[PDB]
């Protein structure tokens, strides 16, 4: 009903942070992507 309090708007936003940092670990770093992307194009071509 859009009746969020400020506290309600704070607890939910932590979850968004919480699960994101969790999926960040499975979403993975940027550096290995740099080598991984170079290997990827080689296979596709």
């Amino acid at each position: 009903e859009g009746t969020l309090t400020d506290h309600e708007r704070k607890y939910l936003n932590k979850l968004i942070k919480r699960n994101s940092q969790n999926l960040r670990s499975w979403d993975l770093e940027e550096e290995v992507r740099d080598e991984l992307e170079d290997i990827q194009q080689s296979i596709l071509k």
């Binding site: 499975w26 990827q40 194009q41 596709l44």
Partner: protein, 232 residues
């Protein structure tokens, strides 16, 4: 163990882990339609078998990795699938809709058709219709209403086929997902300009486009256009 996780679209899962792949739950456990790998994971614990979805084989799968915002295919919906060469892509759609949903598979060629019939027995929710999609009045009896109309027909006059079937079978505010191959329509001009025409053609046919996605690197000069059917 592989950690199966949910995905933005309902009925789709990613077996995240060391080897990460797009995955759908198997409607008919213990067999693979076209030799894809199968993964089963225990959940409280009961093992539920899954099937791998290969982007290079199914264009609908190639759309997912692109990050299509809205797919009108979701569990418990009636879907009309045009251009059912075989069960390479239909089986996965049947998995997403689930037992409550149904899939109306339409194909023309005889030889692939017999393969499609060979699968439909294993999947009760799939209703195979071997007929030409250019004359929808033929199979009007065998098809209910459908929340989405997904088309892979690689024809120069595909836009007409979508309009005819959509006028007859698609609900208002329903889904329309189209796969376009720029080479088949016009090879002279770049792949972008062909797509812009196909978007314009749909609009004249009372279909409002929502988003457009190119399918590289999975295939070259292909794009998926997602639109909604505004009859009003």
């Amino acid at each position: 163990k592989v950690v199966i996780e949910p995905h933005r679209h309902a009925g789709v899962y990613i077996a995240r882990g060391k080897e990460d792949l797009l995955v759908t739950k198997n409607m008919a456990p213990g067999e693979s339609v076209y030799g894809e790998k199968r993964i089963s994971v225990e959940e409280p614990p009961t093992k539920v078998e899954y099937r791998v979805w290969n982007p290079f084989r199914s264009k609908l799968a190639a759309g997912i990795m692109g990050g299509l915002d809205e797919l009108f295919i979701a569990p418990g919906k009636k879907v009309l699938y045009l251009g059912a060469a075989s069960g390479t892509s239909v089986s996965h759609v049947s998995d997403v809709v689930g037992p409550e949903g149904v899939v109306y598979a339409v194909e023309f060629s005889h030889r692939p058709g017999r393969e499609l019939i060979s699968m439909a027995k294993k999947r009760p929710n799939i209703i195979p219709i071997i007929e030409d999609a250019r004359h929808p009045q033929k199979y009007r009896m065998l098809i209910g209403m459908v929340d989405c109309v997904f088309a892979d027909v690689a024809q120069p006059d595909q836009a007409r086929i979508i309009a005819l079937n959509s006028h007859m079978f698609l609900k208002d505010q329903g889904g329309v997902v189209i796969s376009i191959k720029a080479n088949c329509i016009d090879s002279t001009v770049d792949a972008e300009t062909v797509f812009a025409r196909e978007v314009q053609k749909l609009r004249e046919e009372r279909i409002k486009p929502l988003e457009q996605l190119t399918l590289e690197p999975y295939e070259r000069d292909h794009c998926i256009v997602v639109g909604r059917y505004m009859r009003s």
